[PDB]
Coordinates of C-alpha atoms in Angstrom, one line a residue:
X1 CA -117.6 350.7 -13.8
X2 CA -120.9 351.0 -11.9
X3 CA -122.7 352.6 -14.9
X4 CA -124.0 350.1 -17.5
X5 CA -123.3 350.0 -21.2
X6 CA -126.8 348.9 -22.1
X7 CA -130.1 348.7 -20.1
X8 CA -146.7 339.7 -11.6
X9 CA -149.5 337.1 -11.5
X10 CA -150.3 337.6 -15.2
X11 CA -146.8 336.6 -16.4
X12 CA -146.3 333.2 -17.9
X13 CA -142.5 332.7 -17.4
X14 CA -141.7 329.0 -18.3
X15 CA -139.7 327.1 -20.9
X16 CA -138.1 330.2 -22.4
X17 CA -141.3 332.2 -22.7
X18 CA -142.2 335.6 -21.0
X19 CA -145.8 336.6 -21.8
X20 CA -148.9 338.4 -20.6
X21 CA -150.9 335.2 -20.7
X22 CA -153.0 333.5 -18.1
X23 CA -154.4 330.0 -17.9
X24 CA -157.9 330.9 -16.5
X25 CA -158.5 327.1 -16.7
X26 CA -156.2 324.4 -18.1
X27 CA -157.9 324.9 -21.6
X28 CA -159.0 328.6 -21.5
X29 CA -156.4 331.3 -21.8
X30 CA -156.8 335.0 -21.4
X31 CA -154.1 337.3 -22.7
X32 CA -153.4 340.8 -23.9
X33 CA -153.1 341.9 -27.5
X34 CA -150.4 340.1 -29.6
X35 CA -148.3 343.1 -30.5
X36 CA -145.9 344.2 -33.2
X37 CA -143.0 346.7 -33.4
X38 CA -142.1 348.3 -30.1
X39 CA -143.1 346.8 -26.7
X40 CA -144.9 349.3 -24.4
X41 CA -146.1 348.2 -21.0
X42 CA -144.2 345.0 -21.5
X43 CA -147.1 343.3 -23.3
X44 CA -146.7 340.3 -25.7
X45 CA -144.9 340.2 -29.0
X46 CA -146.8 338.3 -31.7
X47 CA -143.8 336.2 -32.8
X48 CA -143.4 334.9 -29.3
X49 CA -147.1 334.4 -28.6
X50 CA -147.6 332.5 -31.9
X51 CA -144.4 330.4 -31.1
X52 CA -146.0 329.6 -27.7
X53 CA -149.2 328.3 -29.2
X54 CA -147.4 326.3 -31.9
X55 CA -145.0 324.8 -29.3
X56 CA -147.4 324.1 -26.4
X57 CA -150.6 323.4 -28.2
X58 CA -149.6 322.3 -31.7
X59 CA -152.6 322.2 -34.0
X60 CA -154.9 322.4 -31.0
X61 CA -155.5 326.1 -30.4
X62 CA -158.0 328.8 -31.5
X63 CA -157.4 332.5 -30.9
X64 CA -160.2 335.1 -30.3
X65 CA -159.4 338.7 -31.1
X66 CA -162.1 340.9 -29.4
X67 CA -160.8 344.3 -30.5
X68 CA -162.9 346.2 -33.0
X69 CA -160.0 348.7 -33.2
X70 CA -157.3 346.4 -34.7
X71 CA -156.5 343.1 -36.3
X72 CA -153.0 341.7 -37.0
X73 CA -151.3 339.0 -39.2
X74 CA -153.5 336.0 -38.4
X75 CA -151.2 333.8 -40.5
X76 CA -148.7 334.0 -37.6
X77 CA -151.3 331.8 -35.8
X78 CA -151.8 329.6 -38.9
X79 CA -155.1 331.3 -39.6
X80 CA -156.7 330.0 -36.4
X81 CA -158.1 333.4 -35.4
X82 CA -161.7 334.4 -35.0
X83 CA -162.7 338.1 -34.6
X84 CA -165.5 339.4 -32.3
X85 CA -165.7 343.2 -33.0
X86 CA -166.1 344.9 -29.6
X87 CA -165.3 348.5 -28.9
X88 CA -163.1 349.1 -25.8
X89 CA -165.3 349.5 -22.7
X90 CA -168.3 348.2 -24.5
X91 CA -170.0 344.8 -25.0
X92 CA -170.6 342.4 -27.8
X93 CA -174.1 342.2 -29.2
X94 CA -175.9 339.2 -28.0
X95 CA -176.0 337.9 -31.6
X96 CA -172.2 338.2 -31.7
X97 CA -171.8 336.7 -28.2
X98 CA -173.9 333.6 -29.2
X99 CA -172.0 333.3 -32.4
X100 CA -168.8 333.2 -30.5
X101 CA -170.1 330.7 -28.0
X102 CA -171.2 328.4 -30.9
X103 CA -167.8 328.7 -32.6
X104 CA -166.0 327.9 -29.4
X105 CA -168.4 325.0 -28.8
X106 CA -167.7 323.5 -32.2
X107 CA -164.0 323.8 -31.7
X108 CA -163.9 322.5 -28.1
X109 CA -166.3 319.6 -28.6
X110 CA -164.1 318.3 -31.4
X111 CA -161.1 317.4 -29.2
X112 CA -160.7 317.3 -25.3
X113 CA -157.2 318.7 -25.6
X114 CA -158.2 321.8 -27.6
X115 CA -157.7 325.2 -26.1
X116 CA -159.1 328.7 -26.7
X117 CA -157.2 331.9 -26.1
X118 CA -159.2 335.0 -25.7
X119 CA -157.7 338.5 -25.9
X120 CA -158.6 342.1 -26.3
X121 CA -156.3 345.1 -25.6
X122 CA -155.6 344.7 -21.8
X123 CA -157.2 341.3 -21.7
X124 CA -159.6 342.4 -18.9
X125 CA -163.0 344.0 -19.8
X126 CA -163.9 342.5 -23.1
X127 CA -161.9 339.4 -22.5
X128 CA -163.6 338.8 -19.1
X129 CA -167.0 339.2 -20.7
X130 CA -166.4 336.4 -23.1
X131 CA -164.3 334.2 -20.8
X132 CA -167.0 334.3 -18.1
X133 CA -169.7 333.6 -20.7
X134 CA -167.7 330.6 -22.0
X135 CA -167.3 329.3 -18.4
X136 CA -171.1 329.4 -18.0
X137 CA -171.6 327.6 -21.3
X138 CA -169.1 325.0 -20.3
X139 CA -170.9 324.4 -17.0
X140 CA -168.0 325.3 -14.7
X141 CA -170.1 328.0 -13.0
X142 CA -173.8 328.4 -12.7
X143 CA -173.9 332.2 -12.1
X144 CA -172.4 335.1 -13.9
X145 CA -171.2 336.5 -10.6
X146 CA -169.1 333.5 -9.8
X147 CA -167.7 333.2 -13.3
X148 CA -166.8 336.9 -13.3
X149 CA -165.1 336.8 -9.9
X150 CA -163.2 333.7 -10.9
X151 CA -162.0 335.4 -14.0
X152 CA -161.0 338.4 -11.8
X153 CA -159.1 336.1 -9.4
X154 CA -157.1 334.4 -12.1
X155 CA -156.4 337.3 -14.5
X156 CA -156.7 340.7 -12.8
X157 CA -155.3 342.9 -10.1
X158 CA -157.7 343.5 -7.3
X159 CA -159.3 347.0 -7.7
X160 CA -160.4 348.9 -4.6
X161 CA -162.0 351.4 -7.1
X162 CA -164.5 348.8 -8.3
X163 CA -167.7 347.5 -6.7
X164 CA -167.2 344.1 -8.3
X165 CA -164.0 342.4 -9.6
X166 CA -163.5 341.0 -13.1
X167 CA -164.4 343.4 -15.9
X168 CA -164.2 347.1 -16.6
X169 CA -167.8 348.3 -17.0
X170 CA -171.3 347.8 -15.6
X171 CA -172.7 346.7 -19.0
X172 CA -170.0 344.0 -19.2
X173 CA -171.4 342.6 -15.9
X174 CA -174.9 343.0 -17.3
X175 CA -174.1 341.1 -20.5
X176 CA -172.6 338.1 -18.7
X177 CA -175.8 338.2 -16.7
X178 CA -177.8 338.2 -20.0
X179 CA -175.9 335.1 -21.1
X180 CA -176.7 333.4 -17.8
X181 CA -180.4 334.2 -18.3
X182 CA -180.2 332.9 -21.9
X183 CA -178.6 329.7 -20.7
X184 CA -181.0 329.1 -17.8
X185 CA -184.3 330.4 -19.2
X186 CA -184.0 330.2 -23.0
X187 CA -182.0 327.1 -23.6
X188 CA -179.0 329.0 -24.7
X189 CA -180.7 330.9 -27.6
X190 CA -182.0 334.4 -27.8
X191 CA -185.4 335.1 -26.1
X192 CA -188.4 336.0 -28.3
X193 CA -187.7 339.3 -30.0
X194 CA -189.3 342.3 -28.4
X195 CA -189.3 345.7 -30.1
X196 CA -189.6 348.9 -28.1
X197 CA -189.7 352.7 -28.3
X198 CA -188.3 354.9 -25.6
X199 CA -190.9 357.5 -24.6
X200 CA -189.3 358.8 -21.4
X201 CA -186.1 359.1 -19.4
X202 CA -185.9 359.9 -15.7
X203 CA -182.7 360.7 -13.7
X204 CA -182.7 360.9 -9.9
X205 CA -180.2 362.7 -7.7
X206 CA -179.7 365.2 -10.5
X207 CA -178.4 367.9 -8.1
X208 CA -174.6 368.4 -8.5
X209 CA -174.5 366.5 -11.9
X210 CA -173.6 369.1 -14.5
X211 CA -175.9 372.1 -14.0
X212 CA -177.9 370.0 -11.6
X213 CA -181.2 370.3 -13.3
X214 CA -180.9 368.4 -16.6
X215 CA -180.2 371.6 -18.7
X216 CA -176.7 370.6 -19.8
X217 CA -177.6 367.0 -20.8
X218 CA -178.3 365.3 -24.1
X219 CA -179.1 361.6 -24.7
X220 CA -178.0 359.6 -27.8
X221 CA -179.5 356.3 -28.7
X222 CA -177.2 354.0 -30.7
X223 CA -178.3 350.8 -32.5
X224 CA -176.0 348.7 -34.7
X225 CA -173.2 351.3 -34.5
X226 CA -175.5 354.1 -35.8
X227 CA -177.2 357.0 -34.0
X228 CA -180.9 356.5 -34.2
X229 CA -182.1 359.3 -31.9
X230 CA -180.6 362.4 -30.3
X231 CA -182.4 364.4 -27.5
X232 CA -181.1 367.7 -26.1
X233 CA -183.0 368.3 -22.9
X234 CA -182.9 372.1 -22.2
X235 CA -183.6 372.8 -25.8
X236 CA -186.6 370.6 -26.4
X237 CA -184.8 368.8 -29.3
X238 CA -186.8 365.6 -29.7
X239 CA -187.9 365.9 -26.1
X240 CA -189.5 367.9 -23.3
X241 CA -187.7 368.4 -19.9
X242 CA -189.3 368.7 -16.5
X243 CA -187.1 369.4 -13.5
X244 CA -188.4 368.9 -9.9
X245 CA -186.1 370.6 -7.3
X246 CA -188.1 369.1 -4.4
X247 CA -187.6 365.5 -5.5
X248 CA -184.2 366.1 -7.0
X249 CA -185.0 364.6 -10.4
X250 CA -185.5 365.3 -14.0
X251 CA -188.1 363.6 -16.2
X252 CA -188.0 364.0 -20.0
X253 CA -190.6 363.0 -22.5
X254 CA -188.7 361.5 -25.4
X255 CA -190.1 362.2 -28.9
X256 CA -189.7 360.6 -32.3
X257 CA -187.9 357.5 -31.1
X258 CA -187.7 354.9 -33.9
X259 CA -188.6 351.2 -33.3
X260 CA -185.7 349.7 -31.3
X261 CA -184.6 346.1 -31.4
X262 CA -181.6 344.2 -30.1
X263 CA -178.7 345.7 -28.3
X264 CA -179.2 349.4 -27.6
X265 CA -176.5 351.8 -26.3
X266 CA -177.6 355.0 -24.6
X267 CA -175.0 357.7 -24.1
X268 CA -175.4 360.9 -22.0
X269 CA -173.4 364.0 -23.0
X270 CA -173.0 367.3 -21.2
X271 CA -172.3 370.8 -22.2
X272 CA -170.7 371.3 -18.8
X273 CA -166.9 370.8 -18.9
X274 CA -167.2 370.4 -15.1
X275 CA -168.9 367.1 -15.5
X276 CA -166.0 364.7 -16.3
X277 CA -166.1 362.2 -19.2
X278 CA -165.2 358.6 -18.3
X279 CA -165.0 355.8 -20.8
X280 CA -166.7 356.1 -24.2
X281 CA -166.0 359.8 -24.4
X282 CA -169.0 360.7 -22.3
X283 CA -170.1 361.3 -18.6
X284 CA -172.3 358.1 -18.4
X285 CA -173.7 355.4 -20.7
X286 CA -175.2 351.9 -20.7
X287 CA -176.2 349.0 -22.9
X288 CA -179.4 346.9 -22.7
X289 CA -181.2 344.4 -24.9
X290 CA -184.8 345.1 -25.8
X291 CA -185.8 341.4 -25.6
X292 CA -184.5 341.1 -22.0
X293 CA -186.4 344.2 -20.7
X294 CA -189.1 343.3 -18.2
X295 CA -192.3 345.4 -18.3
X296 CA -192.4 349.0 -19.6
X297 CA -189.1 350.3 -18.2
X298 CA -185.5 349.6 -17.3
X299 CA -184.1 351.2 -14.2
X300 CA -180.3 351.3 -13.4
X301 CA -178.8 352.1 -10.1
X302 CA -175.5 353.9 -9.9
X303 CA -173.4 350.7 -9.8
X304 CA -175.2 349.5 -12.9
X305 CA -174.3 352.6 -15.1
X306 CA -171.1 352.8 -17.1
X307 CA -168.8 355.4 -15.5
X308 CA -170.8 356.1 -12.3
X309 CA -170.0 352.5 -11.4
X310 CA -166.4 353.6 -10.6
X311 CA -165.9 354.7 -7.0
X312 CA -163.7 357.6 -8.1
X313 CA -167.0 359.3 -9.3
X314 CA -169.1 358.9 -6.2
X315 CA -168.8 362.6 -5.1
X316 CA -170.8 363.5 -8.3
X317 CA -173.1 360.4 -8.7
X318 CA -174.5 360.1 -5.2
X319 CA -176.0 356.9 -3.7
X320 CA -179.4 357.6 -5.1
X321 CA -178.3 358.4 -8.7
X322 CA -180.4 356.3 -11.1
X323 CA -181.5 356.4 -14.7
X324 CA -184.8 354.9 -15.9
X325 CA -186.0 354.5 -19.5
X326 CA -189.7 354.2 -20.0
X327 CA -190.9 352.4 -23.1
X328 CA -193.8 351.7 -25.3
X329 CA -194.5 348.3 -27.1
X330 CA -193.6 348.4 -30.8
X331 CA -195.8 345.2 -31.1

C-alpha cells in the first residue's frame, strides 16, 4: 500500500559515490570527517571515502586530519594521513601551520597530479584556515581575504549571521592573515621571536556585558595548551580593576604574567549566567601571536573577537565593544 516497508553544493555524487567532499581546486579537496558506525547528518563513511581516494587518485593522495579530538584508522587510507591537532573553533599554532605547509609542499612538488584532502569535523572552520593558507602558499591568491572568500564560495553555505564568509571564528581569519604576512614579509618563515608580558587589559562598551562594570569577569591566558595566568577582576586576583562609568570602560592592571612567547589564547569568563557562552565554553576569547604584535598593545574590534564576531550577539556586544591588551617587552 501507500505505507512503505523500509525507509547540496557540498555533495560529490558521481561514479557511484555520495560524499560530503568538495574540490576547492582540481587538486585541493575539503571534506568533513571520515566517519565510522552510524551516519548522522549524512556525513561521509570512511570505507567509501577511502575507496574514493584509492579509485580516483590511486597512490596520489594525502589526507590531513585537523581534529585534535579524534583520529581514525589511517590504514584505510594506506597510511597517507597527517594530523594537525586543532581544537574545534580554534587555530593551529603558527609552528604547526608552517609544518603543515612544508609537508604539503613536499608532497605536492613531487608530482603535478598529486592531491591533498583536508578535513576537520564539519570541514569549515579549521579546514578553511588551512585550505586558505595553502592557496596563498601555492600562489593562487595574494590575500587572505580572497583565499578565505573563495574557500567559502566553493565549500560553505552563505551565512547572513557572519561578517565575512569562509571560516567559523575571528581568530581563524586572523591566522590566515598571519600566514599572508609571513609569506609576504618574512619569506614564508616565522618572524623574529618577540617575548611579551601582559600588563593591562581594557574593555570598551562594557555597559550591558555581564554586570556591566567588569565585576563578573575573569581572564585566562593559555600557552601551549596550559593555563599560564588567571585574573579575576572584581576580586583583585592577579589584577586591579578600574571601572569608568563616564567612558563606559574597564581597565585592569594585570599582575604576575609570565613571559609569553608564540601563540597565546586569551579567554574571558563570567560569573553572570546572563552573559551567554559561545564557542570555547566562554563568553569571548581570541588568539594572537607575540611575534606579530606591533608596538606595545594589540587592540581587537568586535568583529575581531571570537563570539562577538557573530551577528546573533550584537545586542550585547555593541558597535564600540573592543578589547586591548597592553604589554611590556620581555627582551
